[PDB]
Amino acid sequence: EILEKLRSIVSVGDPKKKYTRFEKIGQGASGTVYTAMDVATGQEVAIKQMNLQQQPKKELIINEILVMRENKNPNIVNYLDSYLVGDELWVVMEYLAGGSLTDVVTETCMDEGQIAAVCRECLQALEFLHSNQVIHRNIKSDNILLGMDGSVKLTDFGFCAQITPEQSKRSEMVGTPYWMAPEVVTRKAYGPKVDIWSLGIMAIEMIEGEPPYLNENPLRALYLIATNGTPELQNPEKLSAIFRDFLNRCLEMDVEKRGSAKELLQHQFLKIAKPLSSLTPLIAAAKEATK
Numbered sequence: 565e566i567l568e569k570l571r572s573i574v575s576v577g578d579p580k581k582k583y584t585r586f587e588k589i590g591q592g593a594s595g596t597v598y599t600a601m602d603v604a605t606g607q608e609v610a611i612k613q614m615n616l617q618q619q620p621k622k623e624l625i626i627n628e629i630l631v632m633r634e635n636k637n638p639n640i641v642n643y644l645d646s647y648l649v650g651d652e653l654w655v656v657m658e659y660l661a662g663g664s665l666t667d668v669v670t671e672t673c674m675d676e677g678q679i680a681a682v683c684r685e686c687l688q689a690l691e692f693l694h695s696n697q698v699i700h701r702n703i704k705s706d707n708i709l710l711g712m713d714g715s716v717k718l719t720d721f722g723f724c725a726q727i728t729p730e731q732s733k734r735s736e737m738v739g740t741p742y743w744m745a746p747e748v749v750t751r752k753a754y755g756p757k758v759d760i761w762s763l764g765i766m767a768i769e770m771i772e773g774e775p776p777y778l779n780e781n782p783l784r785a786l787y788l789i790a791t792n793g794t795p796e797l798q799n800p801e802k803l804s805a806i807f808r809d810f811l812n813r814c815l816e817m818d819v820e821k822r823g824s825a826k827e828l829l830q831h832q833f834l835k836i837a838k839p840l841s842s843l844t845p846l847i848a849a850a851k852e853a854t855k
């Protein structure tokens with residue numbers, strides 16, 4: 565009954581009177597997401613509402629709130645507060661007007677400059693987390709949020725892990741199959757570089773619209789990751805050499821040879837990044853496409 569630890573972390577007081585103008589903007593396995601407005605303050609917020617029954621290990625909920633409140637950063641969606649509403653947990657975060665990267669990758673064609681701009685900002689989030697001994701473990705386009713200024717922010721700490729010098733590696737088979745690094749899929753001990761792999765897969769989303777093997781069922785994709793290793797692009801000839809190089813460094817099978825987030829921030833690919841204002845036309849296109 566670590567529900568007591570969860571009960572001591574959360575704020576008390578009715579969120580249903582602190583916040584108004586509730587609108588469902590999202591579903592998800594982890595719960596439903598609503599927008600709302602702080603009754604007093606006017607601030608727009610996103611609230612994730614999670615059924616405590618839905619989650620069998622309430623230990624992960626605790627971990628999610630702590631990591632988020634302890635690791636604030638400009639490239640991470642800001643945690644504001646949390647509340648228990650009966651058997652439902654509400655997490656309140658800053659609302660980022662814009663959209664999901666998923667909408668952009670499925671509905672637009674991104675140029676290398678735009679892709680490099682997104683990758684740089686995500687690598688900055690990862691550098692910060694990994695330096696704070698946190699592995700995200702669920703990097704994908706669905707967890708990247710884009711601001712109306714082209715701000716890029718990472719969210720979702722539902723699956724993350726804290727490591728320590730004593731225990732530098734994890735062994736849970738956690739993530740979303742198509743984005744999971746081979747060492748994770750094959751139950752080897754793994755470290756922060758699983759996030760770099762997932763980032764590589766997200767770069768393939770930005771190129772091709774989908775992670776490798778998405779037409780296949782999840783179990784089949786796990787088999788394909790275990791057997792193929794480094795995925796191949798549909799049309800690699802369409803990419804610059806330096807982009808292909810960046811991809812190769814993100815998607816190295818040899819963990820020790822795979823780029824760290826720090827190493828990758830100095831890659832040549834990132835030097836072609838467009839300014840973040842370059843992403844706002846993608847956001848406009850995606851909103852129009854998903855009317």
Ligand SMILES: N[C@H]1CC[C@@H](CNc2nccc(Nc3ncc(C4CC4)s3)n2)C[C@@H]1c1cccc(Cl)c1
Nearest residue numbers: 590592594595610657658659660662663664719720
């Ligand atoms: N699957 C994802 C789809 C995209 C986004 C919802 N859609 C949307 N659309 C337009 C603006 C906007 N802005 C937001 N600012 C702050 C937000 C915090 C994350 C809540 S969201 N979100 C989030 C959602 C998500 C993230 C993490 C866990 C789960 Cl379970 C679900």
